[model samples]
Target: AFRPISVFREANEDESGFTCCAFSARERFLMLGTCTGQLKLYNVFSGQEEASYNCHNSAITHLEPSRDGSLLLTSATWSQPLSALWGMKSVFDMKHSFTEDHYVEFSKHSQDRVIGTKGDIAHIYDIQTGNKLLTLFNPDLANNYKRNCATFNPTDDLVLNDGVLWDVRSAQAIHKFDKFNMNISGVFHPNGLEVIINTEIWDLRTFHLLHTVPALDQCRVVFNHTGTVMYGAMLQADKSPFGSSFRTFNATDYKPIATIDVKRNIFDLCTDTKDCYLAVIENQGNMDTVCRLYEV
Candidate 1:
């Protein structure tokens, strides 16, 4: 059904607005980023604001929760201009402020390391020692393009940036997927054997295309609890009322499941570990930014 199970709305305050949001592994707890540099934590099930932090001095451009939902990673605009790590208790413990970038993340396994990107360079850092362990980059595209999105392999020993997969131990390209738009981000399948690169999902073991799905020019792909389904947002170039929407597909067969019209620009999407709930953040001009939850 297109109807959502619950919707949470908050008024835009001053220059602050909803920029990004995420859900915990198996709860209604949500972390939201604001344009005025605030990271607010809320419990959607109870409709209570749990905690809030001044994430940056300016605007928070990105916010992400760890796979286990214990740690948080955040980055902002010119204010702090760095990436930071936070504990579940809202403790600010680590910072990669030296790296000038907009994206940072914790490894899915131990969460002992942090991966950051600036331009085309990807830096790996030790979370405990705060020491840079390795750096990976593509010399061919150096200074010519931007590589902003990256993710750690479930094994915690590898990272994927755009279409290039890197081995963290050797700081070398172990494999690179070709013919896909590297400007868009790609995610590693939970099984660690495949990746969803923009519209095409590729298999790492066979190095062949598994299936292709329709996606927006700037779509963010997300998988369900068991990695059996994939979800992504689509935008219209004509600027119609039905422009902003989301779609779901069977991950194994790439079959279309459903599409829902959101009627607003979707800034982010998240689902719980059990895939019982889906959360979406929407932001448009002048209107109150809203977070909608669906009983998936």
Candidate 2:
């Protein structure tokens, strides 16, 4: 059962909107970034803002914490987006600069590797040694998507850009799915057996179309902590557009679970490490924002 536990809203008149968020590795802290480039740390238990950092001058596009909670990958949309790795306080390096607001990915292959992407290209970096290992790109850039977010599979051997797949060892396009495009974000199933690109879920082994989620289009779909459940928000509000709604799915069968509709717009949702709770950022016309914790 899902139930709301807490709601947090900023009371500033000139507060900018939130852009990105992530939970710390141990699930003790919730990190949020804003369009005004403020990185805030909130304690998960108390739901209080612990600290704020003015690291980015522009909109903070992405925030990804490392698996061990040792490092954080944050990117901002300035003249061109710049990606930096930080160890809580200071920057480690300004190594990868993506032209778009692509989510920085940590490699499943190794804890030392990270991936960042732009419209037409992506780069793999060594977080430990500060090295740019390889650059992956499409030859023609004809179908470049500004909102195309590349992701690594569960095993970390391949990269998926829109509907195209590239082998991580070499910068080669290994496979491309026809009649498929990402409305915004595409993600691989934690088991590496499936990938959901926009509205289609395809079996990775045979590249066969396994399922289609018509309501998942334009909404970023996410999985529970154990990958046993999937969630997708509805793209529009029913009456006044000042409400929140999302569809849940049973990951084992890829079937719809339930739909939760509320009275506010859900800007983002992040599940805790154990799937015991969900942190949702809600908004009212993008003016008043609130972060609500739901016990699952």
Candidate 3:
């Protein structure tokens, strides 16, 4: 079920109007983050609120669950975004189990426009014994430029740069291409194509740039369960009549897969189950602040 057109009615709610939402690996729950600094968990099948808590004092920028849905990672915007995830065990107990397992305070300058990937030097810590396991950045691999978004690929031993895979363990510059920009947030197709601003589907093996979508100013980008399809946040400029919208891209070729124009200017989005349904959060106006959701 790649890109389904059967958009359903709105089904969930955020107490403080979350800016971002993400589904668990099994599609059993939906996690949302609010502008008021609250994180809410919901049941996808019953439309019941599962859990709610204050995760940050400032804006919560992004949220993600580990590959197994056993942990929840939350990132905040405070000059330096805060990164932490709650274990599935903690989500069930709702008390001490969901404690902060890993914590790191990065320099404010390190997180400028930081999204989608993890940067260099700055990393995670084990709360149990206070030991640092992974050092994503090294002086050689990242000389002066700070690392951007990153994720571990099953084939490689080190984390891949936002769109390209980097061998941090080896400290070698594997390859480079202009397909994706360090400026825009990108999505990684688990099997292949990486979408950066809908520019082109970059062939990792051949190191080739495949042009698909025209160059565009994209706000956010996400993938379906298989990471085969992408959903990007479309900004709604105040002066123009175009309200916020969502664009679907073919993960393999970065093609224009689909689009959904909405009422309010969109700020963030997430999906669950088969990637056919989307959870949208509208922009919070200055006075009447609230985030709305449109399911598709």
Candidate 4:
């Protein structure tokens, strides 16, 4: 039974504070996102700030690196945000803040496809040239819905939207999920069985109907490192309940694992080289946060 180390503080001095974090593929450096739209890179072992940059227009919603780890993808509000390609240099010397050149008008997608709120837009870019590969949002969903997450399949051949699948290679879409109200949380299992999501479970190969699980309306979901199982966190919505729930589903049987309990908003998560869980939980009101490990 151990606790997480408080590695660094917000360099912004006085602000709403930091929110997101990611690790280099080699796991040598850690980068944190702040409310002020800056990214701070640190030496994971020394806990020292090695570099910093203003990377987005509004608060950065998410950050990701390509599978090969050569480039970085950063996303945020609808305006001139970025997908900067950082070369193999220390954080101090690499280039930062490059705008994306490829963009499609939101209306090109459908009212049901776009995902955003607060009048913002969503985008996905190629790290090397900042080319906008796919856009999953438009004004309808952006202005009125809770559509906030987007991802590419492992093969990058398709874009996974709410209940639809857009084939990027062919630029066509199909309703891949049966009519269910739940928003998706994770991708299809890495080994491939079914789609793991926040609201409903579905067959990946046939897009057939499956069972729906119960969870908090606003809880978050994720998959294991290998994607053989689906994991979800039912967070404490209010202060009184005080308990967070984590459930896992076997891809084969679609049965629950019955153990892992994770309450509170696990705002950020990443699995290590050995496939161990490393995560940060921002407690209710963001006043008491903890970084912890889940040993399987």
Which is better, 1 or 4, measured by TM-score?
1
**What is the C-alpha lDDT profile of model 2 across 68-105, one tens digit per residue?**
77777888767355667677535443444444535577
Evaluate all candidate structures by whole-model CA lDDT and list the values in order.
Answer: 0.70, 0.71, 0.50, 0.49
Top lDDT hit: 2
**lDDT tens digits, residues 111-181, model 4?**
11212212123355443444554555432322222333445555555555544566666655655444333
Candidate 4 runs further than 4 Å off: 1-16, 45-48, 77-79, 82-128, 133-145, 182-186, 216-218, 234-254, 258-265, 281-296
Model 1 over residues 71-162: C-alpha lDDT tens digits?
67888767555777776645554444535756787777787888887766778878767788887887653322233477888788778875
TM-scores of the candidates are: 0.85, 0.85, 0.67, 0.67
Clashes of each: 0, 2, 8, 2
- Pairs in clash, predicted candidate 4: 114-137, 244-263
- Cα lDDT of candidate 2 equals 0.71
Q: In model 2, where do residues sit more than 4 Å from their true spots?
A: 11-17, 89-101, 140-146, 181-185, 234-243
List the candidate 1 regions with Cα displacement exceeding 4 Å.
Answer: 11-16, 67-70, 90-98, 141-148, 235-243
Please list the residue runs of candidate 3 whose C-alpha ends up more than 4 Å from where it truly belongs after superposition.
1-15, 25-28, 43-48, 79-81, 90-131, 134-147, 154-158, 162-164, 179-182, 193-198, 215-219, 234-243, 287-295
State how far residue 202 of model 3 sits from its true place (Å): 2.0
Q: What's the residue-level lDDT of 10 in candidate 3?
A: 25
RMSD of each: 3.5, 3.6, 7.2, 6.7
